[PDB]
Swiss-Prot record, chain A:
This is Exocyst complex component SEC10. The modification Phosphoserine is found at residue 45. Component of the exocyst complex involved in the docking of exocytic vesicles with fusion sites on the plasma membrane. Present with 2340 molecules/cell in log phase SD medium. It comes from the Eukaryota. The lineage of its organism: Eukaryota, Fungi, Dikarya, Ascomycota, Saccharomycotina. It comes from Saccharomyces cerevisiae (strain ATCC 204508 / S288c). Signal peptide: none annotated. Belongs to the SEC10 family. The exocyst complex is composed of SEC3, SEC5, SEC6, SEC8, SEC10, SEC15, EXO70 and EXO84. The chain holds residues 98 to 146 of 871 of the full protein.
From Swiss-Prot, chain B:
Belongs to the SEC15 family. It comes from Saccharomyces cerevisiae (strain ATCC 204508 / S288c). Present with 4280 molecules/cell in log phase SD medium. The exocyst complex is composed of SEC3, SEC5, SEC6, SEC8, SEC10, SEC15, EXO70 and EXO84. Interacts with SEC4. Signal peptide: none annotated. It is found in: Cytoplasm; Cell membrane. The chain holds residues 153 to 203 of 910 of the full protein. This is Exocyst complex component SEC15. Component of the exocyst complex involved in the docking of exocytic vesicles with fusion sites on the plasma membrane. It comes from the Eukaryota.
Length: 49, 51
């Protein structure tokens, strides 16, 4: 009964909810990733230069 | 643990069923062996059980 459905509630609801929130924050992290990569290779033009 | 719950009631149910089956057969053999000084439904019900 609602112990198992409580695992559906907390696990499914919190898993979906913090899955979207943590994965969207991870998308902001990937925004910082390509940010630092773009500034990185853009600073690495003097390497080939 | 909801699948250990459902698994526990699942295999508990199936083993309860097979336990009921062997309980029935050994119960019938007890009904056979109980009959002393009758010798008439002995071969009838006993040979029905061994079938």
């Amino acid at each position: 009964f609602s112990e198992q459905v409580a695992t559906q509630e907390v696990i499914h609801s919190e898993n979906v909810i913090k899955l979207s929130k943590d994965l969207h924050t991870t998308l902001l992290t990937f925004d910082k990733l390509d940010d630092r990569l773009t500034n990185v290779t853009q600073v690495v033009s003097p390497l080939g230069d | 643990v909801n699948n250990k719950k459902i698994s526990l009631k699942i295999s508990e149910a199936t083993i309860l069923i097979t336990k009921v089956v062997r309980i029935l057969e050994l119960s019938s053999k007890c009904q056979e062996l109980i009959t002393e000084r009758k010798f008439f439904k002995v071969l009838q019900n006993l040979d029905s059980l061994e079938k």
